[PDB]
Structure 1
Amino acid sequence: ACRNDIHRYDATFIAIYKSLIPAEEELEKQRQLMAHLENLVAKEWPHAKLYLYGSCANSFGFPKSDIDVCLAIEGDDINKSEMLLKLAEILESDNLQNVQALTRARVPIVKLMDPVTGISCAICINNVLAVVNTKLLRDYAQIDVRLRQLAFIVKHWAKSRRVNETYQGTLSSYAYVLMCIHFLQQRRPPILPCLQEMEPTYSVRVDNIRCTYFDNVDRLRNFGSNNRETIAELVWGFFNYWAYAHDYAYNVVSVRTGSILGKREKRHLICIEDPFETSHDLGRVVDKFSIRVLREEFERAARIMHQDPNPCAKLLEPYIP
């Protein structure tokens, strides 16, 4: 069963959606900065490639002036420290402000702040697998608009309800997009395909991990065109799965497969399998306490999406400790 008036809230959810997406003027400043930093890095390393990654490149990012950049370069004696310090002075002689050398769990990072656009940028060497990660989600976001629409709704819900911190036992935004992709894959008729179970047209390799899938996604623009579910059906339907339908004891959600894999075949309380790094359970951060808070927020989200006379504002009302 579902609401008889569910489509009355399609209007608001998309209005919420297109407000959460970054403005074009903001993204114009990003491409202009990136085109400048690509040409600048290429002057020192003609064989290096700059790739964006993270929220600023998978097309599932909220508005902000911080971008992440992976400097891809090939070789064997690749020392990222000596490169990033040489790169640090090329930024400083380019009149870029606040060129800082930083570390995150010992990975060398350098950060800059562009005076032209006010955008910040964090640069690291050879984080290539994270680049292919965002390429997949960007490729998936091109197939159906409802993926972007649903994922922006859920990500806003996780932040408003204070369940978007892995350091507090909840799930990252990368995990939430995987749950949305997998939810839209299991709807019948399908909204999203399983790119990795298709004829390969893209195949790379990052340290004995071969990422291979079909990435001619503009050939798929009409894939989910036989599924008439609106976003108020999906948003309601998403939280309904994770509150009542997900078999938390035996099930794995698998974008890599587009189906439900068995969990018993091997701390995992909610299993979200990474599409390429398949041993990386994105729910390993959850513990026996935070799983209860997650499922309580799932059950809260479902009843609101099923009963509340104004669910679009009730679903996202902030959580106050």
Structure 2
Amino acid sequence: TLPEAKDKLSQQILELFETCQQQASDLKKKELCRAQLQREIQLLFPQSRLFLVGSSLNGFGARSSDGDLCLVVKQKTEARHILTLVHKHFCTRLSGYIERPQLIRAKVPIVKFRDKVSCVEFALNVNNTVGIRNTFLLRTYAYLENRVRPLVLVIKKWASHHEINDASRGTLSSYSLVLMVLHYLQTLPEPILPSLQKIYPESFSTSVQLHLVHHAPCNVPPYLSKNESSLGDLLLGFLKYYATEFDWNTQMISVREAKAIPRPDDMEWRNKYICVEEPFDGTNTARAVHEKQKFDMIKDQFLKSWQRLKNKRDLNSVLPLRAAT
């Protein structure tokens, strides 16, 4: 299943999609690593399970997507004690096939490591279960329509190429972008995506047992929309929408509502530049964008890329196609 591709830009977007999309063999090496590590971690926490989460499973992965793992142990004092124990385990016992494990310090503490078996970089956290839930929310969107995945992928590569796709460095997280693409698709005049949580709350409710949340994409049917915009029309529109129309200073993006909502007067959103509502809990995913200079970098790059693309409808105007493939 693939979109139209009547023009050059749309064809280049599909070409980039098909050569960079995460292949089944990439996902098998990540799953073999996940199962081996769960087995390995269970020596320490026998009541624990290890989940693949994020780009590896949400449908928006590229061959270069790192792996995200979520360790479920039956509030943060425990989460940090477990993460440091797991880390010492990786350093002492697992050093034969687990390279350079490091505790990275962030809102969600992480153990970063490289699997020498798959040669793949991984990020493991402890008990951040919301990432399991939204993995399968996003996955259900990722396959709800054939344009969502090519658009999201070219947009991820685009943001990464322009050094605005790294929340650790002050810019937009991949999750923020994905939510922004999905919001753009949700609010078109003839919309390309509905709200999954409004139409089927039963398949994404917070009472669903974590180990069954992945059943949700098997339940939800595909979305047929009236919009006939091709991939190049939509990539241009997505750059224009955030470059010109979307008021960062007054509104927040709610994929849960499939709407733009006014910024709440709560203290979380009081001084933030960018407000994207996490769909399961109520928090700002773009909270990492807190420096004016970086905020401007995002704004200026949206404007500029929409300009170069408008004039020359070649994907090379905003993303060198030789630097990805």
Q: Which moved more, 1:181-190 or 1:96-105?
A: 96-105
Identity of aligned residues (%): 28
CA distance in structure 1 between the aligned counterparts of 2:252 and 2:135, rounded to whole angstroms: 21
- 8 A Cα contact 1:195 1:215, kept in partner: no
Look up the match of 2:26: 26
For each residue in 1:284-315, what CA deviation from the matched residue of structure 2 results, as whole angstroms up to 9, or x when unmatched?
A: 6244333333222112122223221x431001
* 1:163 to 1:116, Cα distance in 2 relative to 1, 3 A: closer
The aligned counterpart of 1:188 is 189
Alpha carbons of 1:34 and 1:289: their partners in 2 closer, same or farther (altered >3 Å)? closer
| 8 A contact 2:109–2:125 mirrored in 1 | yes
Residue 117 to residue 283, structure 1, CA distance change in 2 (3 Å):
closer
Name whichever of 11-20 and 44-53 sits farther off: 44-53
Q: Where do 1:142-221 residues align within 5 Å?
A: 142-201=143-202, 202-204=204-206, 216-221=216-221
1:15: Cα distance to partner? 0.5
- What's the CA shift for 1:317? 4.3
TM-score, normalized by length of structure 1? 0.80
Between 296-305 and 280-289, the greater mean CA deviation after superposition = 280-289
5+ long unaligned stretches in structure 2: none
- Write the distance in 2 (CA, Å) between the matches of 1:312 and 1:45: 48
The separation in 2 between residues aligned to 1:230 and 1:260, in whole angstroms, is: 24
Q: CA RMSD in A?
A: 3.5
Q: Please name the residue that 1:210 is paired with.
A: none
Give the structure 2 partner of residue 291 of structure 1: 295
1:306 aligns with 2:305: no
> What is the distance in 1 between the residues matched to 2:294 and 2:89?
44
Distance 1:248 1:120, change over 3 A: closer
The alpha-carbon deviation at position 177 of structure 1 amounts to: 0.5
Any idea what the Cα deviations from partners look like across 1:219-246, whole Å, max 9, x if unmatched? Answer: 5443134332211111011011111221
What amino acid is aligned across from residue 162 of structure 2 in structure 1? R
Task: Write the distance in 2 (CA, Å) between the matches of 1:124 and 1:264.
Answer: 29
Query: What is the deviation of 1:253?
Result: 1.5
Deviation, 1:154, is 1.0
User: Could you say if the C-alpha distance between residues 142 and 70 of structure 1 is closer, same or farther in structure 2, counting changes exceeding 3 Å?
Assistant: same
- Change in Cα spacing, 1:97 to 1:261, as seen in structure 2 (3 Å) is closer
* 2: CA distance, partners of 1:187 / 1:245: 12
Q: Indicate the SS of the match to 1:222.
A: coil
Return the alpha-carbon distance in structure 1 between the equivalents of residues 47 and 54 of structure 2.
23
29-38 vs 43-52, greater mean Cα deviation: 43-52
Q: Tell me the distance in 2 between the aligned counterparts of 1:83 and 1:317.
A: 39
What's the CA shift for 1:52? 1.4
Q: How does 1:1-321 map to 2 (within 5 A)?
A: 7-42=7-42, 45-64=45-64, 66-74=66-74, 78=78, 80-81=80-81, 85=85, 89=89, 92=93, 95-98=96-99, 100=101, 102-105=103-106, 109-110=110-111, 113-201=114-202, 202-204=204-206, 216-263=216-263, 265-266=265-266, 267-280=271-284, 282=286, 285-308=289-312, 310-317=313-320
Partners of 2:300 and 2:65 in 1: CA distance:
33
Aligned-residue offset at 1:46 = 4.8
| Preserved CA contact (<8 Å) 2:60 2:153 | yes
Cα deviation, residue 19, structure 1: 2.0
Q: Which has the larger radius of gyration?
A: 1
How many aligned residue pairs are there? 307
Structure 1 CA distance, aligned partners of 2:169 and 2:245?
25
Amino acid at match of 1:22: Q
Distance 2:22 2:309 in 1: 26
Q: 1:45-84 CA distances to partner (integer Å, 9 max, x unpaired)?
A: 5532211123323232333384221110219995653675
Cα-to-partner distance string for 1:144-174 (whole Å, 9 max, x where unaligned): 2211111111111111122223355421111
Once residues 71 and 253 of structure 1 are traced to their aligned partners in structure 2, the CA distance between those partners, rounded to angstroms, is 29
